[PDB]
Every structure is written in structure tokens, then in C-alpha cells.
Design a protein around this ligand. Structure first.
Ligand SMILES: *P(=O)(O)OCC(C)(C)[C@@H](O)C(=O)NCCC(=O)NCCS[C@@H](CS(=O)(=O)NC[C@H]1O[C@@H](n2cnc3c(N)ncnc32)[C@H](O)[C@@H]1O)[C@H](N)C(C)C
Length: 575
């Protein structure tokens, strides 16, 4: 209270400059090539900023960044902030129209290309930053207030129209300073892994840099037991965030791969108590935290440090408001719930509140409101998350009233996506389901219509994380006696060679889908692909990669051949 006030918090750049001044020789960044210390990071960043200010001397413009984590991409984030501008991650894994739409929404001037590999941009103004000329020698940095935009993340956008959520310097410095839920210290080594399109990345990067710690970048490829083990062992990562279902996957595959971490946060969806239990009894000294919050409130709203006693609950508490934030639980009538075991909506106040939804006034007025807190009448955001208090005054997550789902940490408005499928030519009806198989989520799509009507165009237009893992055509969507989609019925519906029939039984058991002579059109996804590859490696492989045998071999023709290359299909069943 009064930390709820944006102006009580410093700028990202003021705080970083403070760190760089105190800790010139501490590792700021550790990548495959070495480390960069604070003084070096600061210089590089200032130089690149000299270039930016030359081309965009007026504070407050949106600049893009592309490429997987590198010393250059971090440096770019810093240079952008230093110039009074804000960053937008343009993911080139995504379809052109989608990225172009983002850029239009925030008026993205120029993209700073750190991509190691050749950029097939072709619509967009990319400038490669590596080996850049070293422009005119200095510029005074604008001294902006803490309410300046640091970065943009987008609303789901399953309508086809994603809305920009502008987050502020104060949101970040609030997140990273004066907290109790994690120990932020100069000795911390934070794994930088999460997709920079979304807000866990915020914690992983700024948590370290604002505290004099080191960012340990994953430049080794998708996170899995071996890569994690490597980032911990060789590079000394002691602190990490993992979206709940990735945490689940790792714990199931190789629980000891968590060994060496002092601090681990997970969240982004409802935590699995069994997996939390296994990680904790496996690693009794681990400081484990359940982080909760919407992008609109900047990374975290509530966090809960996990205890022994929690391991007997049906759900891990999401705990309490972080410093610089406040929450209320509201009834249907708008009055705060003061007592245990009574469900209501989570409402948020404080320094984490984002600007609103750029170019959407209605959404903005709907969830960004003024509401009384204590005495004062404060700006607030309504999460749409139903929770309840427990005996100890800790929040306990219930769920949502609208159709919004988390798909392995990704935010989707499912109804709008479904409707998007209905609009496709020759498609009568469509049902979208998210499934909880194997600690992980799957997005399953069943549609009715012309037999030729499969919506491949639409899928090519969807950002990758919005594409169903299975698209099946059906006779009809099963209705119950009450007229409601019969979900169990639907999932139920969704269920040759010597070794070709083995691969397809395996895939069936793992995916919950069909045989007949493709994994990622069959209900596979990146997490399940991890598990499958790990099985295959248990079996006398590991020349068999996440890349080779699955993506290059994804048919089950190509996979029955890649399998029958080294070993037998029936063996994996008991591995
Ligand atoms: P494959 O699928 O191709 O690849 C696998 C990986 C792991 C690479 C891929 O799936 C991946 O990267 N997944 C993670 C995606 C990601 O980085 N997501 C961002 C984190 S979620 C974010 C805000 S949010 O998207 O708006 N979601 C907020 C709502 O989510 C629910 N929620 C959040 N936290 C919860 C907890 N602890 N318990 C229960 N529910 C929770 C609520 O409905 C929120 O309103 C936030 N900022 C997280 C916390 C960082």
C-alpha cells in the first residue's frame, strides 16, 4: 500500500545502472561462448542505444527483436529500454500475417535481428545487430518516469485479432525488488529459457540483471533433462522458472535433472500435486514456488512458497500478493470476501498493472476499472479467476467462468478459436477440447462438414501454439440428452507391418489417438515428443534426437523405419 503506486518504483535502466556500477565484474550473462560482465553489458547496450537514439530520438517507440536467446538479444532489450523505447518479440516461427498484425497493432518501427540463422523476413524492416558499425559516439539518455512502457505482450488473439498489453518499467522493478517469495541476490544464476513473447521471460531476465546476478541463457535447444542438467552443471544455473506442464514432464522423465537448483518456480496453470510431491521428496532442500498471475498484472500477482503440509492438499495454494501488488476477492455483488471457503473473483491493484488493451476500449473498460481498496479508490484489473481463501488466509485457485484455457502455459480463448473454425468454408460445426494427459495438455479439434473441408488454410494462419494437435472429421458432435456437447463421448470417439503396427500402438497409448500408417497431426505435441524421444533413448538410442527421428521422421512410416533402424517397436512398451 503505497508500493501499489507506480512512482515508488525505479526505472529498469536506473536500477540496472546501479547494479552495473556496484558490480562491474560480476557475470551478467553466460552463454555458450563465455560470459559478459556488467560493465561490458552496459557498454555494449549503450553503444547500440547510441544507434537507436540516432534513428529514433523521441522516447516511446516500439522496437522489435528477433532470434533465440543470445548475448545480442539481451543487449538489445537493454538498449531499447535505455533509449526510452519498449520491446516486442517477433517470433519468426510464426506466420507472416500474424507478425505483421502485431507490428501494426503497436506500430513497430524496426526489428533488431539477432537471429543466427538467415532471416526470411520479406515483409518486415529487419536490421542485423551483430558487427554493427558503432554509430555516433554518444547520446544523452532521456530520463523517463517509471510509468514508461518497457515491453508489449499480446492477448490471446484467437478471434484473429490479438490485442497489445503494454507493461511498464515499474511493473518489472516491482516484480524484481523487495520481494519475499524468492531470494533475488547477486549470486543468483537464473536460467533464461521462457519464450520472450510472454511474461515469464521477464522474471528470468530482469530478476537477475536488476539484482546483480547472472542470466544463464539456454542456447542449447529446447529444455529437456539433458539440456537442463547441462545448464546447471556447466553454467551453474541455480534458479529457474518452468511452466507447470514442463515441470511435470521433467519430473516424470528425470527427477534428478532438477538437482543443483536452489530455487525453482512453476505455475502458469494449476500445479499437479503428485509431481510437486515427487520433486520435493526427491530434492528436500529445494525452495519451490507456485507463481500465479495474468499478463495484465505483469508476471506475478500471487506467489506461494510450497511446504510439506501442502503436499497433502488437493491443490497447491497460490498464496498471497507479491510486494507492489494487492488483491481482493470479490463476490457477485462487488463486496470483498473476508472469510475462508467462499468463492469469488480475483481482483488486482498496484504497480504491476499494465496500460490496458491497445486499440480495444471495450475490453479495457470491462476489466480495467476503479475499485475501492482500503480507504482509497484505486485502479484495478479484474482477473476473471475464481479463487477462495483457506484457513491461513492463502488463496486457492478454483478456475474460470469464461472459455479461456491455458495450453501448456499458453493463454487461449477457446470459444473464439472454435468459432474461427466454424467460419471455415464447408465446415458445419466444430468442438475444441483441452486434455490433461500425462501431466501435459493437448488441444483436440473435432469438426463436421464436407469430407474435403479440412481447414488447412486456417491452421497455416494460426500461431503455432494455437494449432490443434489433432484435427478429426466426425459424423456429428455427440450431444447429451440435455443438448450439451458430450465430451467423454467425443474423446472416446477420438481413440500394417511387423514393426509398423507396434509404433502405432505406442503412439496410441501415449497420445490417446489413432493407428493407420502422423504424430503431430495425431495428437502429439512438443512435450509428448520429448517423452517419446526419451522412451526411445531408454531403449538403446540417443543418436535418436528430438529433431531427427520425430520431426524429420514424423509419419510413422518414417518413424517405423527410424525405429526399426536401431531397435524393435515392442520393446519400448515396458521402458
Ligand atoms: P511445445 O508446447 O511446442 O513446447 C513446450 C514449451 C514448454 C516450450 C511451451 O509449451 C512453453 O513455452 N510453454 C510456456 C508458455 C509461456 O511461457 N507462458 C507464459 C506464462 S503464463 C503467464 C500469464 S498468462 O498467459 O496470462 N496466464 C495467466 C492465467 O493462467 C492461469 N494461471 C497462471 N498461474 C497459475 C497458477 N499458478 N495456478 C493456476 N492457474 C494459473 C490463470 O487463469 C491466470 O489468469 C503468467 N504470468 C505466469 C504465471 C508466468
Amino acid at each position: 500500500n503505497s508500493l501499489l503506486d507506480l512512482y515508488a518504483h525505479p526505472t529498469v535502466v536506473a536500477r540496472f545502472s546501479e547494479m552495473a556500477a556496484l558490480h562491474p565484474h560480476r557475470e551478467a550473462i553466460r552463454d555458450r561462448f563465455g560470459s559478459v560482465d556488467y560493465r561490458q553489458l552496459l557498454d555494449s547496450a549503450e553503444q547500440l542505444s547510441d544507434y537507436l537514439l540516432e534513428h529514433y530520438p523521441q522516447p516511446g517507440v516500439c522496437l522489435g527483436v528477433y532470434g533465440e536467446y543470445s548475448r545480442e538479444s539481451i543487449t538489445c532489450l537493454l538498449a531499447i529500454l535505455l533509449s526510452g523505447h519498449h520491446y516486442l518479440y517477433i517470433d519468426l516461427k510464426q506466420p507472416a500475417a500474424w507478425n505483421a498484425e502485431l507490428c501494426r497493432q503497436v506500430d513497430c518501427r524496426l526489428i533488431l535481428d539477432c537471429s543466427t540463422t538467415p532471416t526470411p523476413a520479406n515483409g518486415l524492416p529487419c536490421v542485423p545487430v551483430r558487427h554493427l558499425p558503432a554509430a555516433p559516439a554518444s547520446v544523452a539518455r532521456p530520463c523517463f518516469a517509471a510509468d514508461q512502457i518497457a515491453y508489449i505482450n499480446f492477448s490471446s488473439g484467437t478471434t484473429g485479432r490479438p490485442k497489445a498489453i503494454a507493461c511498464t518499467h515499474a511493473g518489472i522493478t516491482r516484480l524484481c525488488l523487495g520481494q519475499s517469495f524468492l531470494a533475488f541476490a547477486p549470486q543468483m544464476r537464473f536460467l533464461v529459457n521462457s519464450p520472450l513473447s510472454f511474461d515469464a521471460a521477464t522474471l528470468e531476465i530482469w530478476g537477475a540483471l536488476l539484482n546483480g546476478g547472472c542470466c544463464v541463457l539456454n542456447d542449447l535447444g529446447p529444455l529437456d533433462p539433458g539440456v537442463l542438467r547441462q545448464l546447471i552443471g556447466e553454467r551453474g544455473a541455480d534458479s529457474a522458472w518452468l511452466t507447470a506442464s514442463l515441470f511435470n514432464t521433467l519430473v516424470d522423465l528425470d527427477p534428478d535433472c532438477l538437482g543443483g537448483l536452489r530455487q525453482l518456480l512453476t505455475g502458469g496453470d494449476i500445479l499437479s500435486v503428485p509431481h510437486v510431491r515427487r520433486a520435493l521428496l526427491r530434492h528436500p532442500r529445494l525452495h519451490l514456488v507456485n507463481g500465479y498471475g495474468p499478463t495484465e498484472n505483469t508476471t506475478f500477482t500471487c506467489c506461494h512458497v510450497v511446504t510439506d503440509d501442502d503436499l497433502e492438499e488437493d491443490d497447491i495454494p497460490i498464496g498471497k500478493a507479491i510486494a507492489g501488488t494487492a488483491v481482493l476477492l470479490l463476490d457477485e455483488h462487488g463486496q470483498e470476501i473476508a472469510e475462508p471457503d467462499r468463492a469469488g473473483e480475483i481482483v488486482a491493484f498496484g504497480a504491476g498493472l499494465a496500460q490496458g488493451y491497445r486499440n480495444d476500449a471495450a475490453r479495457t473498460r470491462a476489466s480495467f476499472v476503479e475499485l475501492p481498496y482500503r480507504g482509497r479508490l484505486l485502479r484495478a484489473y479484474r482477473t476473471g479467476d475464481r479463487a477462495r481463501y483457506d484457513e491461513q488466509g492463502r488463496l486457492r485457485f478454483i478456475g474460470r467462468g469464461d472459455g479461456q484455457v491455458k495450453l501448456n502455459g499458453y493463454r487461449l480463448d477457446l470459444p473464439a478459436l472454435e468459432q474461427r473454425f466454424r467460419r471455415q468454408p464447408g465446415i458445419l460445426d466444430c468442438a475444441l477440447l483441452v486434455r490433461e494427459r500425462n501431466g501435459v495438455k493437448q488441444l483436440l479439434c473435432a469438426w463436421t462438414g464436407k469430407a474435403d473441408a479440412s481447414p488447412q488454410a486456417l491452421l497455416r494462419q494460426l500461431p503455432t501454439w494455437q494449432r490443434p494437435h489433432a484435427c478429426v472429421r466426425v459424423e456429428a458432435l455427440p450431444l447429451t440428452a440435455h443438448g450439451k456437447l458430450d465430451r467423454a463421448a467425443l474423446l472416446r470417439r477420438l481413440e500394417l507391418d511387423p514393426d509398423q503396427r507396434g509404433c502405432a500402438q505406442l503412439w496410441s497409448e501415449l497420445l490417446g489417438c489413432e493407428v493407420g500408417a502422423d504424430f503431430f497431426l495425431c495428437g502429439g505435441n512438443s512435450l509428448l515428443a520429448l517423452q517419446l524421444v526419451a522412451l526411445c533413448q531408454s531403449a538403446g538410442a540417443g543418436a535418436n534426437l528430438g529433431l531427427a527421428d520425430l520431426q524429420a521422421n514424423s509419419r510413422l512410416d518414417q518413424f517405423s523405419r527410424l525405429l526399426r533402424s536401431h531397435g524393435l517397436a515392442p520393446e519400448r512398451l515396458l521402458e
